[PDB]
Each structure stands twice: as structure tokens, then as C-alpha cells.
């Protein structure tokens, strides 16, 4: 059932009016959090899962309940380091049982920069964006009429580094969580499929005395096959996310258009050579402004006017 | 249960006021994404699925749990390349277990151009469309009263190629995902039905020592019959999608009406011979404008007036 | 559970302010799509389904799992043309397993003309209807005050055939999907009930060697009884739909009232003898207008005034 | 679970601002459709259903799966006229398996007059009601100020018979569906309880050869006991509905108050002796108006004024 | 699960702006309908129900399916008067299986006066209440300024008996449904617990020939214990409802305050000695008015003014 | 699943603009009703419940169905006073099976004072509160401008005792329901854990004759362990509720601030020494007013002004 419902919520909706997240970063966030949550739900859903994550071959002499005991005992035994006879150590077997939680942990860890960003930065930036947009409308309205406060404020943001460091840390945490997940997933996929099989014994002391119980059961972790397939898919996507997040650091290269220069044409505007090669809060505003200025009617008119110029009658014809 | 609910959400709703997607392209997208999601849910739903995707004939000497072990072991074994004795190699058997995920992967891959289009193009175009529509209302209002800014802007769009390349790439990605899916589905349907049957052994070393376990179990993947039927249906539809997407490229042929010529009749309008045989952003606007201009009251009046003409009193009679 | 919920959504709601579909055609569409969706859900719902669609008599010597293997193997075998010993060929047995999907396919196929109509025609017609209604209110307001634009536009629609052909094709596709479904359902109901029983063997080569497995199992497709009952019900309804859709073609006979003649009484209106015996877009508008004009206050007053006449003081008394 | 949810939706809500259905007829409709839907859901709900609708005594020598085969085979056999040894013919056994669908069929058949009435009459009448109400407010406003259009229109409705025949047919269809359901339910309740027991054999030819299978199984349709109880309840209610629907025909006797006479007191009103002993559209309006006039402030004042009279200062004191 | 959800909908919500039901009568209705619905859902919910309503001790020689046949056969047998060997007649055994429906029947029967009251009285009274309230605001506004229409209207209501008889019958039906339910519940609780045990035989003729089947099974209706507890709880509550409904008849004693006398203080009001010891529609209005007048700002001011008096400056100070 | 959903509805929401309940009393109510509902749902939820509330050790010679009969028979037997051999009498065993209903009964009993308070007091008080608040705004507005009606009204409330007795009874009922629940819970927790084990026999007369059935089964009520833990938790909380409700009676001590004295500073206000050591309706208003006056802008200004004073220019500076 779930799969199509999962597509509606997780894929066709922003399940996570200003643009307080950059569309690429928001998509990166939405993809990065969304992919493991979807894959987790897809692994267990009955469209794939035959049943229990684990099963063991009991002796045929066992009652069905005795076999059920072996399965359930060994499920606990998988983590219990004493219990097992793994050919590759206990830790890979833990990782299989842990694996659905481990995907979720990485998903939540990636959500933490998003939740941190929402509280730490979004309303603070929202206050600035609203102020800046309204000053540009005054500049536009005063242009239609035919002091340098907002640019001197943003000049101070070119000196400032406080808010950009909030973004820098937010990006860095996101990158590291992905990178460690990629190495973990790489190891988890590198773990030989044979690890899905392991030997178990219920022969704790009371059962240990019983000669009728076999010295080992042999058992297979059916999900592990599915998990390895899922892990490779997630590794591919996250491996693509790594260079994208690296690109996010290239902020002055990301400042593709100096929209300020479109206003600079106005006599109500100033010589804002604001290519912030200084990695400062202005640079972060400039990227956010590049998206958020697109909201502005004044910007649209001026960009159109700039593009054609590339005026008083035309401005009045507006 | 689900089937009628599935029809409401997936078929009778846009589960994915300006028209920021072309109706055909949106329908193509909605069909292309919707069909596999529906077919996936239909395969597993209890109205079709007898039960587990897999079952094996144990010996009758096996306890029910021993048989359950064989089924679950072999489900993992299907991917485990060492385990099996397939008559056609391991890979077709992987594809059966993978198949419900593989449909979903193609569905999500087709959603990526849609999600890319929403972020990369829709608000950017929306800004242009709103500007252009409002300029046409000025042209209309100034006609009622009885400079060439928007046409000179759109003239620059006839020089521009940036936004059209966003559409070109969006279309191309969609086409390639379909095409590879069609070849995959063709192979998957071409795979002989006998592949649904495969031989399995639980005889890893501990069980390998046990002489009482048979050297093979024989097993059948019951979903594979349903999947082959579903695959053919999806292949037929997507094979119909391939020429439609090809037609989407024929943009100047898709520019069926020069709505600009309806405004060209006005003295407040200009000689816009704007058959963009140059594949440029203007051409993309022209298609989107052809749909979006239908919103305009002014367009409706002028088209009516043009159709009758095919005026000052009439314009005042409006 | 579902049945009463199904009644609320599918029967007591439009699960599919202008009237952009004709009430009869919309009801025809809603009935035609709704009936199979309801019947599908009713077949499987536990209020009717005993359990699995299929069961086989194993030997009593079989373990319960061995019997479960026979059922599940034979479910796949039903489509597998090699497997069976059907008394009436493989194809009828496919149709039983396919049958719930086949009803849904016809339902979706009938939805395609509806979805096509929504995109291809509804907003285009909506633009015309709004224009025409507003012109009639001007005619009414100008009557209260005491040029032929809309009638000359609609005169051109009497020349035009583009939009009517969209309706013609929409109706024709709907008719053909029903007709083929009726012939399919007729065959499916004509298929002798004995087809519900079929012989199966699990004796692929590994099992073929085993002498203990019987040469055949005998099996019954329990849903097939329910499906035949459902098929007859659906056939009856759709057989009633066939003449209704035929009647939809009789468009000039469907033009029961020349509402234009009610306006023709006005000196602000013209000699619209618009019985469109020419099957042209005007005729399609006339039917849609016949429903949609009922919205108009002016129409209501004029129809009342016409009916009484069957005036200046009365018009002022309004 | 469902029962209390069922009460909220089906009993405490109108699950089906003008009063476009008569309250009695709407209640009759809501009761008539609601009762079978509720009873169907109550029959199957686990608060009553032990399990499967059917069970058979296998031999104790049968495996549990062999017994499950007998149950499922015989469920299909119940409709299969060849299969059985019924003491009262095949048809009563069909009726038991069919019975939950048959209740639903009658429910939907009764919904058809409601759905027909909604489309065929409700908006047409709504247009008339709004017109008539607004004319009465003019009569009231013109009374406060201190031509016979609406009464001459309604006089023509006294000549007309078109809309009343829509109601007549709507009532007649509803009556006949109930009546046939009552006779069916009477027969179904009259069917002796022993019919719940029937003999079955799986001895189609392959099984027919097997001597170990018994010549008959004996089987009981557990729901049939519940269904007979439910059928009697539904029969009682519908038997009460029959005289109510008959009363609905007595339209001039249903015209309990000539509300027009309350307006007739006004000098802005006329001698409307409109006891429509002629069964004409006016009569149908009069009943609908009797409910719908209750909306009117003017009516309330005039009825109050009439009741006290049973005035200019008082009218001004309003 | 359900229990806390049941509390939210049934207990913490009005699951059934004027006060068109008296708060006590509405609470009586809500309690009376709500209690059985809650108790029904509580009986079956898995927090109480072990499983099936019925079970029988088969012979240990029976297969599990043979035992399942005995349970299911005997469930039908409970109503089948021929089948059983009850120590107290068949009818008590019917009542156990019927009992969950019987509670619901009483619940719906009590809802009928509520649904009848909603349609038969609530909008009719609503029209009167709105009129009366607005006349009192005129009296208040005309007091601030410093004919007897509404009191002469209500004087006629003191002559009238039509609407009070609607209430009288509504109350009487509610009382009788409760009373018969109480006697039924009293009998059902009085029925000795041993009735939960009953003897059954599957020995209809085919099974009757089989000597291996026992002459009786012994069976216990596990719900009957729960039902007897529930029945006593419901009996206690409804026994408390009986005197409350009796009190509802004491309408002139229920007319605790002559709110009219608070207005009688005004010179814009009259000598309304309206203790309606005549059981007439005025009396019913007086109770409804007593609640509904509490809405009025004017009433609040006058009651405050009366209470202090117990004025022109004060009225102006308002 | 439920637990986190339960937290959202029951813990993070008011599942039960004036403040018509005191925040402490509302929290007391919400806690008191909420705790048992949550604990009930937590007991049965599969995160805790192994399965059925009851199980018995059958002989190993019993078929699984025979064992299922023993469990289900004994579940009924627990209440049936004849059946058992309890070491501590029948009544403790009833209490275990009854216990989930008994918690709910206490929860609903505590809801009754809340539902009584909502109907009996909340709208009556709401009328008073709105009046009093608006009079204080007149006093404030008349202060800004620079008769004793509301204080003389509230003086009469100091004479009155009618509404306070509604609160007194509401509090008293709540206290008694808690107290009896605490004694019941104390007994239920005091009941020795061994009571969870009890002996049962199915040897009613038909089974009594059978020598193969054991003279006793031994059985354990698995929920009883969970219930005892839950009972102690609920007892602790309710034991804390007892002194809180006692404190609610200390109304003049609860009148922590004479907000009236803040207005008394005004020349538009009077010497309201309204420490209602007379337990009268004024006292109840004073507590409700203490919360509800916090709404008032005027109060906030005056309290601020009082706190600073602890003025005409300042009042104008407002």
C-alpha cells in the first residue's frame, strides 16, 4: 500500500512567502533527508519483506514454537557478542540489525542543520530581507518621483562575518554527516554478502545441558540482501551530494549575477561593486538576495529596463 | 481496498493560478510518473497477491518452520550470486526481486525533471509571464484610451538561449529515462516466463553437512507472472510517450497560433513576426504564452474582435 | 468495513462555478468509471472474499507448507501457457487472474476522455462561456437602459468545426472503450463456469523426478464465481450506456430549447435561427449554453417574461 | 471498531442554502439508503462475524489445507448450479452469497432517484425558487413603500406539467425499488433457515476418481443466520416506507398551508386560490415553497401579522 | 487502540448559533445515544475480547478445521431453533448473539426523536426565536430612544398547541424506547449466567449418520459475561434517565424564571403574566426562550438593571 | 504505533476566547481524565501486550483448539462465581477482567463534572464576564475622558450563592470520584500478585462426565502484572490531585490579588473591599475575573500604572 502514499508525501510534497532556504540547498536537504526515509520504508513494506528480518533452520524435530524460540533468541544473540560464531566478527552482524535505525540516524543528523538553520538563521535573515526589499521599493518609488542607508548597512555586512559563519557551520555539519555516512555505507556495501549468514546457539547453561538441541543453528538475515541493494543506491546519490555541497562553499562563484548593478543604473543607487570576494555576511545575503530579489516588481521592471538598455518616458509608461 | 482510493488520488487528482507547466507536458509527466506507482501498488495489493512473493516446495518431512526457513533463505539467495543454479544466470532473478523498486526508481527519475523544472524554471518564467500579461493589459487599456518595451524585451529573449536550454535539458532527461526504462522493460518482458522458477539450496556448510536436507529446493516467484503482465502494459504506454516527447521538441511547429498577431492588429502593438524558427527563449515563452494568454480578458476580446474582423464603436461597446 | 465508505466517496460524492461538463455526460462518465471501481473493491472485500483467490486440493500427505507451495505455484502457472491442462485453453484462465486489473483498465480508459476533455476543451470553452454570458448581461443591461458582436462571433462558430471535433472524438473514444468492454464482458460472462476449475502440476524437472507428487492437482478460482456475477451487472449497466452515448451524438435533437430565441425577443438581440443542423462548434456551445445560461439572472427574467408574454413597466418593476 | 464510526457518518450526518429536497423525502431517502449500508457493514464487522462466511466439516483425516480447499471450493460451488445437492434448489444458495451485494444494489438503486433528482430537478427548481423569493421581497418592500408577474408565471406553472412529472417519476422509481426489495426480502426471510445448510462435493473428475474424498461435505453458511435477522429489520422499516411514499403522492393534501394567502392579504398581492387540485408544476412548487418560504423574513413578518390579525403603524413598527 | 479515540469523539465532542435543543434534553440525548455506542465498541475491542464471540470444546480427535467447523456451525445454530438443547429455551441464546445489534437498535431508536426534532421543530422554532429576539432588541432600542406585536403573537402561541405536541410526542417516544430497553436490559441481566453455556450438535443428516461425531458439543459465549456487566451499567444510567425525562414534562415547573418579567419593567413592554399553566406552545417557547434569551445583550443589561433595582441615567450610562 | 500518536492528542493537545475554566482546575481535569485513558491504551498496545489477556496450560494431549476452548471458557468463568477455585474469592478476579473498563468509568465520571460545568456554568459565567469586562472598559474610557452599576451588581453577587454552589458541587463530585478511585486503586494494588493466577475447570455437566479433561486448568492473567504497575502510577498522581482539589476550596486564600483595587485607584471606581470571606458568587467571579481580567488592555495599563505608582499626563501618554 504505502509506496504510492510515500511518493505523495516524501516525493511530491515539501514534507520538511520569503525564500529562507536556497532552492539548491533546500533540494539538497530534501533529497538527503528524503532518500533514506523512503528507502527504509521500502525495505520493510510487505511488497518486499517476506516476513521476519531473521529466520533459522531448526531441526525438523523441533516444534514450531521451539523453532520460533530459536529465531527470536538468535535475533537478540546477533548483538550479544558472546553468543555467535561469525566468520567476520560480531560488528557486521550488529550493523544488519542496527541498519534501519542507522539510516534514520543519518537522516535525522542531516535534519539537524536544517532545524538549526530554521531557528538560528531564517528569522534573522527574514528581518534583513524584508528591510532590504522595502528600501529597494523606496529607491524605486523615489526613482518614479523623478540617503545611502541600506548600502551602508550592507557595507557593514561586508565587514561582518557572524551570519556567514552560521551558514559555514551549517554546511560543514551537513557535509561531514554525509561523508561519514558514505564511508559507513561503503563499508556496509563492501561487507561480503555471506555475512547475511551466521551461526547461532541457544546453549546457555540450562539449554547447554540439553543434548537434544544442536550445537549450532544456521540462520540468514533476509533483509541484508535488500539492505545492500538499498545501501548502494543511497551511496550513489550521496556521492553526488558531496560535490554539490562543496560547490555551495564557492559563494563568490555562486554569486552569478550582481543584481545590485541593475539598481546601480538608477541615480537613486550607488556604486555597489559588491563582488564579496571577502567571505562575509554580505556574500551570504547576496546569494539569498539573488533568489529573493526575484520577488520584487521593481527588480523585474529594472531588469527588463536594463536588458532593453543593454528612460523617463519608459519609466512613466510602466 | 486500496484500488478505488488509488484511483481517487493518482487518477482523479493532480497528486504531483499561472500555467507553469504545459498541459501536454504536465499530463505526460503525470501519466509517466503515475502509471508505475499505480501498477506497483496493484501488484502487491491483496486483490492480486496470494501472499509472499516467493515460495518453495520443501520436503513433506520438513516442519512448517523448516519450510519457512527455505523460503526466507532462498529469498536472500536470489540476489546472492553464489547460491543459485539459474538456467539463465543470476541477473534475471535479481530483476524479479528488484522489480518493484526498479519501477519506483524510474518513476522518481521521471519526477526529477519535474522537480528540477519547478525550481529551475517555474518561478523565473512566472516573473516573466506576469510582466508580459500586465504589459498586454496596458496595451489594451491604452487601446481603450483612444513604448515598445515588452516586445524589445522579448526580442532579447529571441536572442537569448538560457531558459530554453533549461527546457531542452529537462525534456532530454525525461526522454532518456523513459527510453532506458523501455529497453529494460522490453528485456524484462522478453525474459522467458520459466525464469520465474529457480533452484535453491540451503546447503551452506553447517547445513551442507546435513544429508537429510535435499540438494535443491525448487521455487517459484509468483509475482513474476503479474510483473510480466504489468511490464507489458507499462511498455505500451511509455512507447506511446516516446513520440509525444519527440513532438515536444518541434517547438516552432508546436507554435500553432501567433497570438501576438492578434495584438499586432492594435496600433498600440508592433510587427511581431515572431515565428521563432530560431530555437530561443522567445519560442519557449511563445508556447507558454499561448496557453497563459488564454487567461487574459483582453486577449479574449481581441481574439473575438479579430475573429469577427476576419472598430472603435465595438471596442467602446465592450 | 469499506462498503459504506465506498458508498460515501464513489456514490455520494463527485470523486472524479461553470458547468464545464454536461450533466448527462458527466453522470455517464461518473457512472461508467464508478461502477467497475466499486465492483472491484466489492469483490475482494472480506465481506465477500473467503481468502485467497485460488486454492488447490493437495494430497493429505502434504505438509501445510507443501500445500501452500501448490497454491502459489499454480497461481503463477495460470498465466504460464506451458503449465496447464485447461479444458478451454489457457486464455480464459489468464482472464480470471487478470480480471480485476482488466476492469480497472477499462475504468482508466474511460477516464482518459474525461481527462482529455478537462485539458483539451474545458478551459477553452470556459473562456467562451464567460465572454458570452457577460455579453448577454450587457444586452440585458442595455435593454434596461431603454453591436452584434457575440452573435457574429458565434456565427463564426457555426462555420467552425474545431472544438466540436474535440467533443466528437471524446465521445467516440468513450463509446469504443465501452463497446469493447461489453464484448469482453459478454465473452467473460459467456465463459462456462467450469473454467473456474483447472488442473495444475508442479512437476517441473526437479519435482518432475519426484514420484510422490501427484501428476495433477485440481484447483478452483473462487473469485471467478463472484466475478461472473459482477461481470453481468456491469454488462447490464454498460449496455444501457451504449444507447445514451449514441443519443449524445444527436446534438441538434439534443438542442431542446433555443434559449437564444428568448433573447431574440429583445430589440438588443438579433434573428438567431440557430438550430445548428450544421454540426459545428456553435451546436456544441448551444448545448453547453443551454445548461450554462440557466445560471443567468437575465435569462431567468427574460424566460419568465417570455413565458408570461407567451413590457417596459414590467422590466422596470424587476 | 466501525460501529460507532458508522453511527457518526451514516446516522449523525447527512452523508448523502435552499431546501432543494423536501425534508420528509430527504429523510425517506436518507433512511432508505442508509439502513442497508449500515446493516451490511454490521453483518461482516468482527463484532458479529466469527470469520469466513462459509465453513465445511472435512473428514478429520484431511490436512488443514485440504479442509481449506473444501471450504473454498464449495464457496464457488454455491453458485455453480451443477455442483450441489440443495434441498430447495440452487437459487436460495446463490441468494445467501449474493445477499450482501443485493442489499447494496437496492441501496444504489434508491440513490439513483436521488442522484437523478439532484441533476434533473434541483438546479432548475433552485432558479425558480430564488426568482420567486426575490419577487416576494419586492412585494414586501413595495408594501413598505406605502405588476402581477410572478403569479402569472406561477399561473403558467399551474398549466405546466413538465417538472411535476420529473417528481412523479422520481417518486415512482423509488417506490418500485422498495416494493421489489420488500418482496425479495420477504422471500429471503421466508426461506427456511435450513437453507443455511447445504451439501457439497469436490468430486470433479480428478477428485471424483479419488475414493478417499467423501461423496459429500456438509456445510453451513454462518452469515445466513445474521442475514435473516437483518432482512427482517430492513423489511419492517421499508414496509413503513411504502405508505409514506404513497402519502407523498397526495400532493394537494400535502399542501397543508396556502402561504400565498398570507401574502394575499397584501394589496401588493392577488387572489391566489392556488389549491392546485390540478396536479401541475405549481403544486410541486407549492410544497417546495411551503418549506422554502419559511426562510423569508417577509413571510415571517406577514405570518406573524396574519396570525395577530386572525396595519400600517405595525408595519412601520417592524 | 480505539478507547482513547472513542473518548475524544463520543465523550469530548458533540458527535450528534441558536440553542435549538435544551441543554438538559441535548445532554440526555447525547448520553442516551452515546452510552450504548461506547459500550458496544468497548465489548469487542481487543483490549477485552479474547477472540471469537463463541468457542466449543471439540473432541481432541478433531482436526483444528473440524473444531473450527463446530464453532462456526454452532454460531448459526444459536439462532436456529431446531438445533439446540438450551436449558432455558432458544430465545436467551438469540439475545446473546443479537445483543450487540440490540444495543445499537435502541441507540438508533433514541436518535429518531433527535432527528425528528431537528427536522420537525428546530428550523420552525429558529424562525420564531430570531423574530422574538429581534423584537426584544427593538423594545430595547425603543427604550433607549426615551406596538404589542410579539406579545400578541406569543399570546396566540398560548392558545396554540401544535408545536408543543411535537415536543410532547418527541419526549414520549424517547421515554418509551428507554423504558422498553430498561425492561429488556433488566431481563437480559436477570438471565442467569449459565445461559452463556449451551449444548450444540452438528448432527444434521449427513453428519447425523457419522458415529464418530459426538452427540453434543459444549460451548460458551465468552462475550455474554462482558455483556451482562455492560448491561447492568447501561441499566443504571438509563434508570437515572427515566426520572429526568419525567421531569421534562413538568414544563411550568421547569419555567424557573419569567424572563419576560425582566422586560415587563420597561414601559415598552406589557403585563406578561405568562406562567403558561396552560400546556401550550408558549410554554415550550418560554423554556427555549429562557435559554436563548441569555444570548441577548439587552436581556443581560435589563437583568443586571433589574437585579440592581431589586433608571434613565443608568440606561444612558450603558 | 499508537504511543506517539497518543502523546500528540492526549498530552500535547487540549483533547477535552474567554477562560471559562480555571487553568489549574482545567489542568487538574485534563490530567485526571487524561492519565487513565493513556494508561488504558498503553496496557493493551502491542508494545506491551504479548497477546490475549488470559492463557491456560492445557494438557499437551489437547488439540490447539481444545486449548483455545479452555482459555476462552475460563475467560467467561472468571466472572462466573460458580466456576472457580480462587484463593481470595471471586471478586478480585472480576476486577482484573473489569479493570480496563473500571479505569474508563472513573475517567468518564471525572468528565461528568467537566461536562456539567460546561453546560451548567460556562455560558452563564461568560455572559457575566463579558458584561463586567465591558463595564471596566467604560470605566477606563470614562477615565480617559478626564454610575456604580457593575459593583452594585457584583455586590448582589456577594449576597448570591447560586452559582458558587454549582462550583462547590462540581468540585465535590470530582473529589469523591477521585477518592473512591484511590481507595479502589489502593485495594487493587494491595491485591497480592498471586491473584493473577487462578484455577479453572470446564467440567460443566457434559464435560464433567468426560474423564479425559483435567479437574483443573491453571491459568494466569498476564495483563494483571501490567495493571498493577499502571495502578500504582495512577494512584500516585491521583493522590497528588487530592490536596490540589482541597486547595481549590480555599477560595478566599486563592483570591491572591484584589485586581478590583487596581481599578479602585480610579475616581471612576469605588471602595471595593471585596475580599469575599463570605463564600458567595462574587468570590467565584473574583477568581475567574483574576484570570479573565488579564485579557484587558485597561487592566494591563492600570496595573502598570499602579505598579509604577506603588497621572493625567501618563494616561494621555498612553
Swiss-Prot record, chains A, B, C, D, E, F:
Keyword Phosphoprotein in annotation: yes
Post-translational modification summary for this protein: S-nitrosylation inhibits channel currents and ATP release.
Record PTM Phosphotyrosine, positions in chain: 153
Assigned keywords, A-Z: Calcium, Calcium channel, Calcium transport, Cell membrane, Disulfide bond, Endoplasmic reticulum, Glycoprotein, Ion channel, Ion transport, Membrane, Phosphoprotein, S-nitrosylation, Transmembrane, Transmembrane helix, Transport
GO molecular function: actin binding; actin filament binding; ATP transmembrane transporter activity; calcium channel activity; gap junction channel activity; leak channel activity; monoatomic anion channel activity; protease binding
Glycosylation sites: 209
Membrane-spanning segments: 31-51, 97-117, 172-192, 233-253
Cellular component GO terms, alphabetical: bleb; endoplasmic reticulum; endoplasmic reticulum membrane; gap junction; plasma membrane; protein-containing complex
Membrane topology, Cytoplasmic segments: 1-30, 118-171
Pfam family, one: Innexin
Protein's GO biological process: ATP transport; calcium ion transport; cell-cell signaling; monoatomic anion transmembrane transport; positive regulation of interleukin-1 alpha production; positive regulation of interleukin-1 beta production; positive regulation of macrophage cytokine production; response to ATP
Statement: the UniProt record of this protein carries the keyword Repressor: no
Source taxon at top rank: Eukaryota
Disulfide bonds: 56-219, 74-200
Modified residues (S-nitrosocysteine): 30, 301
Membrane topology (Extracellular): 52-96, 193-232
Cell location: Cell membrane; Endoplasmic reticulum membrane
Membrane topology: Multi-pass membrane protein
Expression sites by tissue: Widely expressed, including in cartilage, skin, spleen and brain.
Reactions performed catalytically: chloride(in) = chloride(out); iodide(out) = iodide(in); Ca(2+)(in) = Ca(2+)(out); ATP(in) = ATP(out)
Role description: Ion channel involved in a variety of physiological functions such as blood pressure regulation, apoptotic cell clearance and oogenesis. Forms anion-selective channels with relatively low conductance and an order of permeabilities: nitrate>iodide>chlroride>>aspartate=glutamate=gluconate. Can release ATP upon activation through phosphorylation or cleavage at C-terminus. May play a role as a Ca(2+)-leak channel to regulate ER Ca(2+) homeostasis.
Quaternary structure annotation from Swiss-Prot or TrEMBL: Homoheptameric.
Family, as annotated: Belongs to the pannexin family.
Protein name per its UniProtKB record: Pannexin-1
Organism (species): Mus musculus
Taxonomic path: Eukaryota, Metazoa, Chordata, Craniata, Vertebrata
GN (gene name): Panx1
